[PDB]
């Protein structure tokens, strides 16, 4: 019973996710922003 928190936290976060996904859905991502993170990510992933 010391684990009560995780079973509610889970739901809270989950509800946020599903909303935010939808939010992003009706938005457009400038390529410049994407590249800096995607190119920065791959090489830093140790690729």
């Amino acid at each position: 019973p010391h684990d009560r928190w995780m079973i509610t936290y889970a739901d809270l976060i989950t509800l946020l996710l599903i909303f935010f996904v939808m939010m992003y859905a009706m938005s457009r991502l400038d390529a410049s922003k994407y590249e800096e993170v995607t190119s920065s990510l791959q090489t830093t992933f140790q690729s």
């Binding site: 739901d11 599903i18 996904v21 939808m22 859905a25």
Partner: protein, 246 residues
């Protein structure tokens, strides 16, 4: 049905649905066929696997125990047992038989016949406690079905939200089909949590709460039958048995 369940369900509907209707919702907005099939179909499946069929066919008796209207009969049988002890102190054991030969409580009737037939006191308790613990096991075997159903359904919810995300995330670039898809990620959570916490787990608690009251009356009748065999004096019989009453 039963007064506390009737007040509970009325309060439940006015809270959950009546709150949503104040802020201008629609009842048909909370129905989604795919979410109901995943959560309730998934729950029913996990239950039919996890128990033999002769257990599943007992669920009517489980509900009938949970919502049995309450009876005060314990307060009557206390007087009967004391009267029988009063007879035992003063009269031949034939009176304990013929005083009981029409009695409505079967467990008491059988128990008294065991002492008038002259069976030994530490043998009588070994048949009476056998008859009790069979009744205790029957009610536990009812409650475990609802405790299982209320354990599976939440997780089938998470097997609904993820099977909802796998639809939405698949059509990110199509806002025309995102709408009907995102609904599953909400509603499958809602059926998973609401069924567990407003139907299954409350019923399980109430079966167990009514079982404890059934068993206490049997435990009182046992101390009754044994005190009649001992020939204990009426005031002390009243004093012992009254500890099982409130």
């Amino acid at each position: 049905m039963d007064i506390a369940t009737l007040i509970g369900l009325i309060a439940g509907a006015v809270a959950i649905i009546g709150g949503f209707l104040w802020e201008g919702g629609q009842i048909t907005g909370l129905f989604q066929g795919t979410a109901a099939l995943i959560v309730f179909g998934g729950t029913i499946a996990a239950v039919l696997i996890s128990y033999p069929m002769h257990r599943i066919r007992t669920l009517p008796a489980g509900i009938k125990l949970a919502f049995k209207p309450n009876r005060s009969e314990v307060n009557e049988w206390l007087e009967d047992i004391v009267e029988m002890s009063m007879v035992a102190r003063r009269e031949g054991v034939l009176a304990l038989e013929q005083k009981v030969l029409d009695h409505p409580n079967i467990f008491l009737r059988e128990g008294i016949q065991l002492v008038v037939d002259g069976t030994d006191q530490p043998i009588v308790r070994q048949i009476m406690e056998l008859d009790i613990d069979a009744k205790e096991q029957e009610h536990d075997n009812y409650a475990k079905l609802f405790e299982s159903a209320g354990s599976y359904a939440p997780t089938m919810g998470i097997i609904g939200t993820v099977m909802g995300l796998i639809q939405v995330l698949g059509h990110l670039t199509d806002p025309s089909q995102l709408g009907p898809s995102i609904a599953v990620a909400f509603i499958a959570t809602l059926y998973g949590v609401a069924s567990a916490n407003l139907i299954f787990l409350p019923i399980a608690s109430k079966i167990r709460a009514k079982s404890a009251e059934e068993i206490l009356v049997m435990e009182m009748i046992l101390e009754g039958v044994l005190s009649v065999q001992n020939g204990d004096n009426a005031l002390l019989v009243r004093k012992k048995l009254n500890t099982y009453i409130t």
